[model samples]
Target chain A: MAAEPLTELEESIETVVTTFFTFARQEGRKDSLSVNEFKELVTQQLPHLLKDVGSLDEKMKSLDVNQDSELKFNEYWRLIGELAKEIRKKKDLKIRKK
Target chain B: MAAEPLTELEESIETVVTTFFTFARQEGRKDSLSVNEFKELVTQQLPHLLKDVGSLDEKMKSLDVNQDSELKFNEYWRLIGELAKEIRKKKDLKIRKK
Candidate 1:
């Protein structure tokens, strides 16, 4: 089926999801991100959003809920949620200031 | 502090959050989406992702956990998460097929 053009919001969602796969396929399991993959994702794609996250290793460990070295899609989603919330909070503050 | 240029993924996340505020400001609360605002959002920005959703009203109700007829940021985030997951599942299937 031919897909309809995605709106900005939909495109954003797709970008976020596609990014995980792009990084996840670097090595090992194609469905999950190994520690190195997670680091590369953060260092590269998430440079600004996660700049203050200090240690990428610690951040990965925290998000790896199952305690496995690999970060699953859900785990990556949670990180995205956290980043979104942080952005929303900043936006909220700006809105209130105006 | 001067903000640095956002990566593609970071920009996508910003677009998603900004889209929420852009719609949420149309009515009632500035930080939440009213029924009409929600409808407009889905119709305009989610036409592809939510096209299969039978009823936007029902979908809004399901996301509005507070039963206040308003969808908050977290509520909207949940909707984004669902869409992302759907996209991820489709991508996963394609990856496995390869």
Candidate 2:
């Protein structure tokens, strides 16, 4: 069946999911990110948001729950969620300050 | 200074954040969702992904942590994250079953 026009939310969700695979496919694995890929993802995509994260290396290490030197979709999603939460927190504070 | 071109990941993050405001602004409040707005968002944006969720009302109730009959950005983000995670699990199982 033909798909309906995507709502903004569906498009948003697709973008998030597509991003992980795009980066994950860059190296050894097609489904997960190696350390280098993870670093590249954050540096390039999260330049502004990640400023609060002191070290990308440490951040990657913390997110690699299995310690397999690879970041799975779950791990990557969790990281993004955390980053988004940080933004929301900051935004809320700014709103309250006004 | 001019801004740099957004990376795919950055754009994706922006989409997700923007979508929340788009829906949240539809009615009563510009920053939060009334019950109707929440239903409208999920029904429109999450059609396929939310099929597994039998009742949107129950889902909304469970997610409405503040219990004020409104959905905040944080709550909405968490819902999307959960749906994405579910999709990932299904994809993994498909691969493993093959």
Candidate 3:
């Protein structure tokens, strides 16, 4: 996949994926994100989108599907999906109003 | 959210969301993507990741959860999620092998 330079959209996807590992490796498991890593990710990378979410602990609990207290790539992906949907809703509303 | 500049990860998410609208507006429905729009997106934006997917029609069918001819934002997001998971798997394997 890295043989050819990625397109803008592809690169964007790669960034999203890479960011997970970047934070996930901060402590504990190299693959999954610990609670601290999750908070750091949301605080640093998701400040704007998750600003109003309140209580990162609760948010992590909600997204922790297996109740393992650790967020795997799938759980993190779901969080991103939620954020993407929020962005999409705003975009949709703007288009409709226009 | 736009008041301040988005971080790299946030911008990446925005790009993914905006790319959908970019192609979705090429034809019918400014919000959802038609089959043609999906194909164009896969071919132009996702060329490398989706190249081996064989038929875009089949891929679209599989992702079209509602079974409607068109794909909503959620549907498109799901597709992107799948691609992201693939990249994550590769990254995970590489890290473990090292």
Candidate 4:
């Protein structure tokens, strides 16, 4: 019975939420991302946010806190959250200067 | 030094991320949402997603986790993340049915 069209913000949430699974499902466990899945995800889908995106080997290692060698959806979401926070700070800085 | 146009996903991330602060800065400490701010935010911006949105008092209390009586950006982000996950499951169910 859910028929309402998504609001603009809901659609935006969908984009980020779906992007994770799209890559996570590519190889190995459908629920999480192996190293290559993470690399492939950002390099292709997040080209604009991730600079020097060529090498994610070490980045993935640092993020794998439990040493699981793979990232759960929570981990992936945290990465995006961190990046968004950085953006938030930068915008705040710009606003302060203005 | 930021000049690149954002990708679709990045823009989406920005929308969700900026939204928390927009509500958070409305009153009080300028960093977190007083109860009224959280109420106004969902009532206005998230009309399509939040059902029974009239009673957010308990919802906000559950999300407050720290007993601070205010919703920080992280708390607000977690709320959106939970909602997005619920949406993800619904979409997954639809795909499975089809």
Most accurate candidate by lDDT: 2
Predicted complexes: DockQ each: 0.28, 0.26, 0.29, 0.24
Most TM-score-accurate candidate: 2
Ranking by DockQ: 3, 1, 2, 4
Docking class of 4: acceptable
Clashing residue pairs, candidate 2? none
- List per-prediction Cα lDDT, in the order shown: 0.51, 0.54, 0.53, 0.49
Candidate 4 chain A minimal-lDDT segment of 10 residues = A89-98
Q: Give the per-residue lDDT of model 2 (tens digit) for B1-97.
A: 3244556776676666665556534633355566556656665765554553433444556756544577666556555665565554334321233
Is 1 or 2 the stronger prediction by lDDT?
Answer: 2
Q: All candidates' TM-scores?
A: 0.55, 0.60, 0.57, 0.51
Residue lDDT tens for model 3, A1-98: 23454465666666666665454236333556665565466557645545433234445556465444776665565466655544444533223333
Model 4 C-alpha lDDT per residue in residues B1-98, reported as the tens digit of each score: 54344555565565665554444236323545664455465445544445543224445557465544676555555455545433334344223344
The TM-score ranking, best first, is 2, 3, 1, 4
Report the lDDT tens digits of candidate 4 across residue range A61-94. 5655544467544445555554444334445332
What lDDT does candidate 3 reach at residue B34? 58
Supply the global lDDT for candidate 4.
0.49
**Candidate 4 ranges beyond 4 A from true positions:** A1-5, A21-32, A35-62, A67-72, A87-89, A92-98, B1-5, B20-32, B35-68, B92-98
Q: Candidate 4 chain B: worst 10 consecutive residues by lDDT?
A: B87-96
**Please, what are the lDDT tens digits per residue for candidate 1 over residues A1-98?**
11345555555555566655444335533544754455456556544433344334445556455544765554555555655544343643323223
Q: Can you write out model 2's per-residue Cα lDDT over A11-70, one digit (the tens) per residue?
A: 676656655655543553354576455645566665454444433444556755544476
